[PDB]
């Protein structure tokens, strides 16, 4: 299947005293593998998956230097943006940055992305071709002109189409035991009588990886969405995921209803019936 490497950076200004709170995380697919937290004593990029621990001292020194440099870019930007938007020095504000690369089943470059937000709204992002910018407002349009003059898109594209893919392929090979393993959902159905006349059927999917899944109810082989509920996909805490879908039915008619489960780890979709 396809794979991704994604980094997520958050800075929150502290106007009463000191430098912004800064948190960085890295993922391969739905697996976190590194973190940096400005409030931690180490002041180092830290491992969060066993397969990254084999990287030598030169890796941890370089990643620490670069993630600190990212935090100083955010600190300067929080001051600049306060000015662009004519805001007071009293309030706390937020910058968020996400970037990374996707590869196909062939492990070759498919697409890249680079996106920035101020106070939880779009500011500036690379377009799909990684050769131009989407600016949301006239502050971001001034940033777009500056980054055009400085050839920033070409510098990011070199990483996203090149370096980013080389590292993702290294991690997929080193972490094969887990990163290349699919965990199909463990499925079951439960029944709950509301009254003497109506019942709830709940279709469970447990301990699955990756997170992407589809649960659908049918009545007499036709999709049903009325009288249904479905929770958002949630983490188990052990690296796997959970979801459920439920339908309310007339007591005695349970056999008309089927739950359909689609997942990367299933060669064919599953059908459950009470």
């Amino acid at each position: 299947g396809s794979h991704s490497m994604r980094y997520f950076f958050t800075s929150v200004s502290r106007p009463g005293r000191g430098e912004p709170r800064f948190i960085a995380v890295g993922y391969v697919d739905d697996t976190q593998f590194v973190r940096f937290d400005s409030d931690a004593a180490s002041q180092r990029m830290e491992p969060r998956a066993p397969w990254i621990e084999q990287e030598g001292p030169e890796y941890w020194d370089g990643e620490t230097r670069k993630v600190k440099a990212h935090s100083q870019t955010h600190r300067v930007d929080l001051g600049t943006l306060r000015g662009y938007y004519n805001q007071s020095e009293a309030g706390s504000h937020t910058v968020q940055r996400m970037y990374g690369c996707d590869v196909g089943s062939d492990w070759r470059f498919l697409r890249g992305y680079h996106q920035y937000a101020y106070d939880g709204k779009d500011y500036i992002a690379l377009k799909e071709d990684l050769r131009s910018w989407t600016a949301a407002d006239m502050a971001a349009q001034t940033t777009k002109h500056k980054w055009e003059a400085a050839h920033v898109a070409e510098q990011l594209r070199a990483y996203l189409e090149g370096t980013c893919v080389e590292w993702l392929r290294r991690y997929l090979e080193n972490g094969k035991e887990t990163l290349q393993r699919t965990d199909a959902p463990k499925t079951h159905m439960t029944h709950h009588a509301v009254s003497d006349h109506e019942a709830t059927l709940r279709c469970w999917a447990l301990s699955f990886y990756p997170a992407e899944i589809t649960l659908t109810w049918q009545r007499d082989g036709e999709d049903q969405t009325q009288d249904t509920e479905l929770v958002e996909t949630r983490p188990a805490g052990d690296g796997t995921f959970q979801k459920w879908a439920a339908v309310v039915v007339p007591s005695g008619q349970e056999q008309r209803y089927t739950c359909h489960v689609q997942h990367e780890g299933l060669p064919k979709p599953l059908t459950l019936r009470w």
Binding site: G26, Y59, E63, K66, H70, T73, D77, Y99, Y159
Partner: peptide
């Protein structure tokens, strides 16, 4: 590994 090029401010 993170972006390995030159950084730019808004």
């Amino acid at each position: 590994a993170v972006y390995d090029g030159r950084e730019h401010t808004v």
